[PDB]
Write a structure and sequence with these properties.
Length: 341
């Protein structure tokens, strides 16, 4: 049964609710982004209207084979009417195709559903500037002050400089980057650009990337692993055994691996600056964990909410424990008392 924080009151709508069967009263199913915890249940046999971005709709049609007649892509930053209700899709600064959804209820209430997002001050000049929001369904993944991490730009600067130094010292080094979902494509694209290489990958991953509307993508990626010195591998293979095995397969072309695991936050974030990050090394294999986040830090979250001034907050992450729920509610009240709404 579909939980309450996935339902939009006063409409026939649900958000990211495909794993509950036929939801009673739902006339339109919205999908914020193509991550498995959110699309769980979709397939070629789904026969209700799905509303989403263009990019998410390319992924539904090519990767899950959802039939075309049930895919309803909407343009961003544009007022659309869906089953008699005005909606707007906004860029969520999460993975490719990820959106936040503004719903203008027939009674005058305005609801923002963030989906998954990384809050940014540029959102303060979107269509959100123009009216009041009563209810916020909030991505609270990192809603605690211990969750600090650097900007995406500092993280990519670290990765480019690290990879360029290593391969210029040793032209026979291979760079490997882990992946298990869409998102974080700047990590492997930025490194391949500094090295003058395409990114090599499996046919299944190439297929996925081809759905993303990235400009000039045919110039940046390939399935011919032999021509490339940046390879993508499943995240599970980014360990010493997995990487040793991969280096065997490359036929003596390479004699060293430098690998990257883009994680979210890890508790090495409470002590170390990005500048000071060091790898784990065994022999001719080095593995860097880099804190590339596609979710808000605590401070980015707090700034957004204090700017938006919602009347009510509904968390969508960390909702399963009483300790989590109580912690999040305390911070919401602090924020509201400090800013005065
Ligand atoms: Ni996500």
């Amino acid at each position: 049964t579909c939980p309450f924080y996935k339902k939009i009151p006063g409409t026939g709508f649900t958000v990211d609710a495909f794993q509950y069967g036929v939801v009673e009263g739902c006339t339109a199913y919205f999908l914020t982004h193509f991550h498995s915890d959110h699309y769980a249940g979709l397939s070629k046999h789904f026969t209700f209207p799905v509303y989403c971005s263009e990019i998410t709709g390319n992924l539904l049609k090519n990767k899950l084979h959802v039939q075309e007649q049930y895919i309803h892509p909407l343009p961003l930053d544009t007022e659309c009417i869906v089953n008699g209700v005005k909606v707007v899709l906004l860029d969520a600064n999460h993975c490719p195709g990820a959106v936040m959804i503004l719903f203008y209820l027939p009674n005058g209430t305005v609801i923002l559903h963030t989906g998954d997002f990384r809050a940014d001050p540029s959102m303060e000049r979107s269509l959100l500037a123009d009216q009041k929001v009563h209810m916020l369904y909030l991505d609270t993944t990192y809603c605690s002050p211990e969750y600090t991490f650097p900007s995406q730009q500092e993280v990519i600067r670290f990765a480019i400089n690290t990879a360029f130094e290593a391969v210029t010292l040793n032209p026979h080094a291979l760079v490997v980057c882990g992946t298990y979902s869409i998102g974080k494509e700047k990590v492997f694209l930025a490194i391949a650009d500094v090295l003058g290489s395409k990114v090599g990958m499996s046919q299944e991953k190439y297929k996925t990337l081809q759905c993303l509307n990235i400009p000039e993508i045919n110039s940046l990626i390939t399935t011919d692993m032999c021509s490339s010195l940046v390879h993508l591998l499943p995240m599970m293979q980014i360990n010493f055994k997995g990487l040793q095995s991969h280096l065997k397969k490359c036929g003596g072309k390479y004699n060293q691996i430098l690998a990257f695991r883009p994680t979210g936050w890890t508790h090495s974030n409470k002590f170390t600056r990005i500048a000071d990050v060091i790898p784990q090394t065994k022999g001719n294999i080095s593995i860097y964990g880099i804190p590339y986040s596609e979710h808000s830090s605590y401070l980015e979250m707090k700034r957004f909410v204090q700017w938006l001034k919602p009347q009510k907050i509904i968390p969508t992450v960390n909702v399963g424990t009483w300790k989590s729920r109580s912690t999040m509610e305390k911070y919401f009240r602090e924020w509201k008392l400090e800013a005065g709404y």
